[PDB]
Write an enzyme that holds these catalytic residues in place. Structure first.
Site, PDB file in Angstrom:
ATOM      1  CG  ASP A  17      -6.841   5.312   2.693  1.00 31.59           C
ATOM      2  OD1 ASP A  17      -7.348   5.756   1.637  1.00 31.59           O
ATOM      3  OD2 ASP A  17      -5.741   4.725   2.718  1.00 31.59           O
ATOM      4  CE  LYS A  21      -1.318  -1.243   9.588  1.00 30.11           C
ATOM      5  NZ  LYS A  21      -2.230  -0.223   8.986  1.00 30.11           N
ATOM      6  CG  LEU A  43      -9.851  -9.961   7.627  1.00 31.53           C
ATOM      7  CD1 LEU A  43     -11.220 -10.582   7.667  1.00 31.53           C
ATOM      8  CD2 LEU A  43      -9.188 -10.097   8.994  1.00 31.53           C
ATOM      9  N   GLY A  74       0.831  -1.197   0.000  1.00 30.84           N
ATOM     10  CA  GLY A  74       0.000   0.000   0.000  1.00 30.84           C
ATOM     11  C   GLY A  74       0.863   1.245   0.000  1.00 30.84           C
TER      12      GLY A  74
END
Length: 290
Positions: free
Chosen positions: A141, A51, A99, A31
């Site tokens: 976002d 992340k 997920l 991202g």
């Protein structure tokens, strides 16, 4: 300096090293702020997500404090849970619920969602936002990339790295924060803005689900942002295909004036969401099933 920043961030994150209890890292995405990996919990074999954000590669470094503090110990059924955060060298690592169904972006780019499915996604996101907004949290976002799925079609909001906290004493934010094509006009116009910006962005995600892409997506971001700032609310390319119910719902989201734009709590009562299917209705959309 970089090291001055690192020291401060170390005070807010959890102590210790996730590399002692996690292994078998697999990069599965990237991202604006960094990368996302699958990792295995060494003790159990359980899969989690991690992340990793490089402190030297952020458009706005100071935003890294926000998620790790604001979403600490937050629990909601439609929000991806953050477990821990760590400073690992020059990177911030955030360990999160995995997920396995991936993101909505793959679905909107490769499939045609029906309105039962669109309503299901909107209902899940609005349930999340209603609770977040009531606590003064603004996501900032909202877009398909931020919506993740379980294998059985449950929908959860993620990607809180741009989030903000407002209060009675400081009820609005001013930072130009978000992703160009999804940003609210009043945010782009530097009006002290509140939670309402998320509702606009959700409207743009509904356009993604109907058209496959947001408005002005072929334009440069700066050009697109000017067009969002100056022009009337965007129109669905596929307007003639949608139900009156969906159009009426979208008309409450894409309202240029924040004070007249619907709120999350209000939208939860909207007739369009009566169309929402169960998690099972989403399952056939995911790559592994279509």
């Amino acid at each position: 300096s970089h090291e001055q920043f690192r020291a401060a961030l170390q005070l807010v994150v959890d102590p210790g090293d996730p590399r002692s209890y996690l292994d078998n890292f697999i990069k599965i995405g990237e991202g604006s702020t960094g990368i996302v990996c699958i990792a295995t919990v060494r003790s159990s074999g359980k899969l989690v997500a991690v992340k990793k954000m490089d402190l030297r590669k952020q458009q706005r470094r100071e935003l890294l404090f926000n998620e790790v503090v604001i979403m600490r110990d937050y629990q909601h059924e439609n929000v991806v849970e953050m477990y821990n955060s760590y400073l690992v060298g020059d990177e911030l690592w955030v360990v999160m619920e995995f997920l396995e169904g991936g993101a909505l972006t793959d679905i909107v780019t490769h499939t045609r969602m029906n309105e039962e499915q669109i309503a299901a996604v909107c209902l899940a996101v609005l349930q999340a936002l209603s609770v977040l907004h009531a606590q003064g949290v603004i996501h900032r976002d909202i877009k398909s990339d931020s919506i993740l799925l379980t294998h059985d079609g449950r929908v959860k909001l993620s990607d809180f790295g741009f989030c903000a906290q407002v209060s009675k004493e400081v009820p609005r934010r001013k930072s130009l924060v978000g992703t160009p094509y999804w940003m609210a006009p009043e945010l782009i116009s530097r009006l002290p803005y509140g939670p309402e910006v998320d509702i606009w962005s959700l409207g743009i995600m509904v356009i993604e689900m109907v058209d496959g892409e947001p408005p002005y997506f072929n334009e440069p971001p700066l050009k697109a942002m000017k067009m969002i700032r100056d022009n009337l609310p965007p129109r669905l390319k596929n307007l003639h295909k949608v139900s009156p119910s969906l159009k009426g719902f979208l008309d409450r989201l894409l309202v240029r004036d924040p004070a007249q734009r619907a709120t999350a709590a209000e939208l939860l009562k909207h007739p369009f969401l009566a169309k929402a299917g169960p998690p099972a209705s989403i399952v056939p959309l995911m790559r592994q099933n279509r």
